[PDB]
């Protein structure tokens with residue numbers, strides 16, 4: 001890396017690790033459309049295995065970007081519409097609530113109070129349906145934003161319906177492969193197990209446990225290299241050869257709703273650039289990010305705005321990730337750690353480094 005970049009990263013990251021007590025970390029800066037990688041520490045402390053560019057990490061919520069992108073591609077293919085009511089795809093979903101809730105609502109957390117999480121007692125397809133049928137909304141559709149896995153997960157389960165594929169095959173075929181994310185998995189195969197880092201929560205080594213709609217809402221595992229490649233793709237959609245994906249990417253970055261100074265895409269979250277750092281930093285905090293907030297509709301939605309600060313945080317019980325990019329400046333960063341540390345800290349660091357370029 002050019003010394004500038006080096007200095008920046010090191011200057012900012014080291015202290016973060018030290019303070020947060022992060023066992024491993026990989027970072028990639030995308031500068032002028034070129035990535036530069038940094039790794040630190042361990043992937044597995046016990047076996048003293050270090051973090052490399054091949055180490056796999058749990059994306060947690062950053063999976064939502066993928067979901068949102070696979071959904072846009074489906075839209076671009078003419079297989080679904082955001083305006084379609086949910087029932088068109090899950091006709092058994094017969095209860096009165098479901099009435100006017102469309103794919104758009106689900107995909108954006110504005111359905112009217114769907115829970116953050118799917119209850120752990122929900123296992124079968126039967127449990128699921130019940131869960132849905134019996135859910136009672138707190139608000140009218142399209143009035144209040146509630147960050148929810150059961151909201152977005154559901155959208156992604158249904159988006160792939162017309163295709164005929166399972167969520168995983170569709171992601172693979174339609175997203176991973178075309179983009180050349182060969183080390184990106186929902187289910188990590190045996191041949192890759194050796195590179196899969198241990199999450200660490202309370203000194204204990206942990207892995208994401210399976211659950212309803214996990215693939216769809218938080219099930220991706222990937223590497224710093226593939227992450228960087230994913231960031232490059234979202235930064236320059238137009239260079240993507242596959243029409244639908246290209247288009248699909250752009251739709252995921254479209255602005256459907258606004259709250260405070262933030263806009264809701266399809267998995268992505270964006271702000272206007274330049275941005276008020278206090279805004280994003282503090283906004284990232286759980287108390288704020290997970291709360292119920294009133295939304296204003298953008299009618300019609302605004303197409304992907306080059307001047308933005310695009311991003312998404314993500315976490316599992318043993319990991320914590322962050323991605324941010326500014327299409328207009330051809331810059332981004334990706335931060336992967338095998339420890340779930342505080343959001344604002346991630347935000348602060350990303351902004352420091354990115355502000356410096």
Ligand SMILES: *[B]([O])([O])C1=[C][C]=[C]C([N])=[C]1
Nearest residue numbers: 060061313314315316343
């Ligand atoms: B996801 O893993 O529920 C997620 C959302 C917002 C912040 C973070 N760290 C994770």
